[PDB]
Amino acid sequence: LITVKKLGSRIGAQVDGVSLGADLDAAAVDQIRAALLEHKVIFFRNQHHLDDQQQLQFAGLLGTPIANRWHTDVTFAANYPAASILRAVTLPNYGGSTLWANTATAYAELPEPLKCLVENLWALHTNRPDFRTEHPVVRVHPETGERTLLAGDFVRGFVGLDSQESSALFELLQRRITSPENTIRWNWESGDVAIWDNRATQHRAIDDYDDQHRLLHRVTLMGDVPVDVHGQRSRVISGAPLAL
Ligand SMILES: [Fe+3]
Numbered sequence: 001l002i003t004v005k006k007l008g009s010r011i012g013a014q015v016d017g018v019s020l021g022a023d024l025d026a027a028a029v030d031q032i033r034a035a036l037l038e039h040k041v042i043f044f045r046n047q048h049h050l051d052d053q054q055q056l057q058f059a060g061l062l063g064t065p066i067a068n069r070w071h072t073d074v075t076f077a078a079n080y081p082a083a084s085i086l087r088a089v090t091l092p093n094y095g096g097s098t099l100w101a102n103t104a105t106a107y108a109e110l111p112e113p114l115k116c117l118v119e120n121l122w123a124l125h126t127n128r129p130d131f132r133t134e135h136p137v138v139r140v141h142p143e144t145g146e147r148t149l150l151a152g153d154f155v156r157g158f159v160g161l162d163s164q165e166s167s168a169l170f171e172l173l174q175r176r177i178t179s180p181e182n183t184i185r186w187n188w189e190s191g192d193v194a195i196w197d198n199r200a201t202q203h204r205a206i207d208d209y210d211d212q213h214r215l216l217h218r219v220t221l222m223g224d225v226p227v228d229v230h231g232q233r234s235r236v237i238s239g240a241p242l243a244l
Contacts, residue, residue, distance in 0.1 A: 002028060004035045004042075011102040011201075012184035013039035020047050020193055022057035029061045032195075036062075036083065037144050041100040041184065041196040041203075048191040050087055055193075056219055059085050062195075063221030066244055067205035070101065070178055071152040073198045073220070076131035078234045079241045081198045082223035086216050088192045095209030097185050098194070099178075101202045103148040106177040107138060118173070119229050122159040123151060124237070131239035134159055136228035137173075141199050148200045149177055150226060177202060188216075199223060 003016040015035055018028065035042050050058075059065050063082060074080040110118065121137040137158070139150045151173050157166040176182070185206075186194065196203065222244065226234045 002031050004031070004039070006039065007043075008184050010105040010182050011040050011100060012043070012186075013041075014043045014045065016045075018044060020044055020050055020058050021054050022061075024058070024061060033062060036195055036197050040102045040104070040201050041186075041194060043186065044193045044195075045189065046191045047087070047193050050191075050193065052217060055085060055087050055217060059219040059221065064244065066220045066222045066242060068207050069153040070099070070174060070202050070204040071154060072103070072150065072202050074242070075135060075150065075152060075154045076125045076127040076133055077239065077242050078133050078135075078225045078236050080223055081220045081242075083195060083197050083199075083221045085219045085221075086194045086196075087218075088188045088190060089215040089217055090213055091188050091190060092209040092212035092214050095206070095212075096214050097187050097206050097208070099183055099185050099204040099206065100196055101177045101179075101183045101204075102200060103150070103177060103202060104141070104144070104146040104200045106149045106173075106182055107147045109176070109182075117169075118149065119147075121169075123155045124157050124159060125154040126156050127154070129239060132237040133239070134235040134237060135226055136232065136234065138229055139199065139226040140229060142224060142227070144200070146200065147229065149173060151177065152202045178204075 005014045118137045126132045
């Protein structure tokens with residue numbers, strides 16, 4: 001049987017009883033998707049048999065295949081990724097942990113007046129190609145229906161606010177998003193695989209292994225354009241949608 005074990009109150013679960021690969025049946029893939037959606041980042045250990053080809057084939061069962069600051073992946077693009085699948089290949093003798101934050105509970109826990117603020121706030125995300133996107137700060141997750149905060153390192157400013165103002169509000173939101181109660185810090189061991197939902201998380205790499213060799217292999221799944229709580233979609237200012 002497949003088993004899903006919660007690692008903290010708001011984020012993180014370990015999934016036992018699964019050997020990741022091309023051949024997982026439909027019910028197994030359903031359970032994995034359900035766990036990803038609920039726990040936001042999930043971990044499979046002792047996947048020692050896995051290689052790049054099997055990682056990629058497995059990724060295809062969940063979707064269509066496409067660092068030291070807290071971010072949501074590629075949010076300078078309008079249709080930024082849904083999820084990634086990350087496999088440990090070679091790990092340092094110490095350090096090298098990874099952080100994830102749950103941007104759904106971050107929203108849900110907001111005081112009412114801050115909910116009113118964020119539900120009508122928009123942020124310019126950029127990559128400095130010249131990618132510039134105005135995203136809503138509250139996105140309605142397209143599979144769970146959950147309201148989630150959309151911010152992170154690619155934010156250059158909030159639309160209609162001065163830069164001191166934007167900074168103050170950005171830091172306030174980030175501090176709630178990245179609070180210890182809202183995050184999980186994972187210690188990687190050989191054979192580990194993490195899968196996170198990029199539509200309800202941020203993550204952050206940690207520079208605590210003194211530049212020892214560290215390699216992980218990532219496959220990313222296509223996502224869609226955010227919708228705010230009134231049904232408005234993100235606006236492309238510069239660039240074009242990710243395509244494959
Ligand atoms: Fe990233």
